[PDB]
């Protein structure tokens, strides 16, 4: 279980980083289209 916990924390950290980058890129595209 400890390994499962460590791994879910890594997944969360990386997913949060990817979500933020996608949100930024989505904003840039929205601004370009406006």
């Amino acid at each position: 279980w400890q390994q499962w916990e460590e791994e879910i924390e890594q997944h969360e950290g990386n997913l949060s980083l990817l979500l933020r980058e996608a949100a930024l890129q989505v904003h840039i595209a929205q601004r370009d289209a406006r």
């Binding site: 949060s16 996608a22 989505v26 406006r34």
Partner: protein, 40 residues
């Protein structure tokens, strides 16, 4: 414009899906603690 709108709408789904998945992880953790108590 309409494709940018659709992409932004999908971004809201991605943010909300992540928040739900986090909640699901929390539930598994709450339940694992209960299982550890019964094992004890």
């Amino acid at each position: 414009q309409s494709l940018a709108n659709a992409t932004a709408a999908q971004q809201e789904v991605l943010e909300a899906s992540y928040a739900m998945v986090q909640h699901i992880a929390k539930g598994i953790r709450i339940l694992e603690a209960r299982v550890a108590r019964v094992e004890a």
